Amino acid sequence: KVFGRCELAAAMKRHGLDNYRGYSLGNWVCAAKFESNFNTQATNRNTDGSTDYGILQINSRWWCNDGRTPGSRNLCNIPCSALLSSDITASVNCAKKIVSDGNGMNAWVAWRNRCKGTDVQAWIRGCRL
Ligand SMILES: [Cl-]
Ligand SMILES: [Cl-]
Ligand SMILES: [Cl-]
Ligand SMILES: [Cl-]
Ligand code: NA
Ligand code: NA
């Protein structure tokens, strides 16, 4: 599923991401834009052999099981393929664990490099929330 900008913002708010650990909703929408272009099916390989899955590009090194990332963990206790569903619940719930892991949203390098220090509220401008 490819979400609209405001459709995704609404779904993330409904799931409690708006100011979760102090990150306003625009941070999450900005991260999703640059991680997946709002596409739940997005997958991308990392140099170490792990893979990133779904709308927030959650990686198989630490957070999910894809059966092909040797030496990895599965801290969200989910198959990585569940993160490609049109229902973003698993991605949001896993994201809540990630962002609570010490480094905040710096865990998403695209957030650090493209969203941090910018006017992230722009990403929800015009949206009925
Ligand atoms: Cl957009
Ligand atoms: Cl914020
Ligand atoms: Cl959903
Ligand atoms: Cl933080
Ligand atoms: Na915001
Ligand atoms: Na894994």
Curated annotation (Swiss-Prot):
Gene Ontology biological process terms from the UniProt entry: cell wall macromolecule catabolic process; defense response to bacterium; defense response to Gram-negative bacterium; defense response to Gram-positive bacterium; killing of cells of another organism
Tissue specificity field: In the egg white and polymorphonuclear leukocytes.
GO MF annotations in UniProt: beta-N-acetylglucosaminidase activity; identical protein binding; lysozyme activity
Localization: Secreted
Domain C-type lysozyme, residue spans: 1-129
Catalytic activity, as annotated: Hydrolysis of (1->4)-beta-linkages between N-acetylmuramic acid and N-acetyl-D-glucosamine residues in a peptidoglycan and between N-acetyl-D-glucosamine residues in chitodextrins
Residues holding substrate: D101
Major localisation: secreted
GO cellular component: cytoplasm; endoplasmic reticulum; extracellular space
Superkingdom of the source species: Eukaryota
CDD domains the UniProt entry points to: LYZ_C
PROSITE patterns on file: GLYCOSYL_HYDROL_F22_1, GLYCOSYL_HYDROL_F22_2
E.C. no: 3.2.1.17
Disulfide linkage: C6-C127, C30-C115, C64-C80, C76-C94
Entry annotation: catalytic residues: E35, D52
Pfam family name, one: Lys
Keywords: Allergen, Antimicrobial, Bacteriolytic enzyme, Disulfide bond, Glycosidase, Hydrolase, Secreted, Signal
Record-linked SUPFAM superfamilies: Lysozyme-like
Additional facts recorded: Lysozyme C is capable of both hydrolysis and transglycosylation; it also shows a slight esterase activity. It acts rapidly on both peptide-substituted and unsubstituted peptidoglycan, and slowly on chitin oligosaccharides.
Family affiliation: Belongs to the glycosyl hydrolase 22 family.
Subunit structure comment from the entry: Monomer.
Function per UniProt: Lysozymes have primarily a bacteriolytic function; those in tissues and body fluids are associated with the monocyte-macrophage system and enhance the activity of immunoagents. Has bacteriolytic activity against M.luteus.
Protein name: Lysozyme C
Provenance organism: Gallus gallus
Protein's gene: LYZ
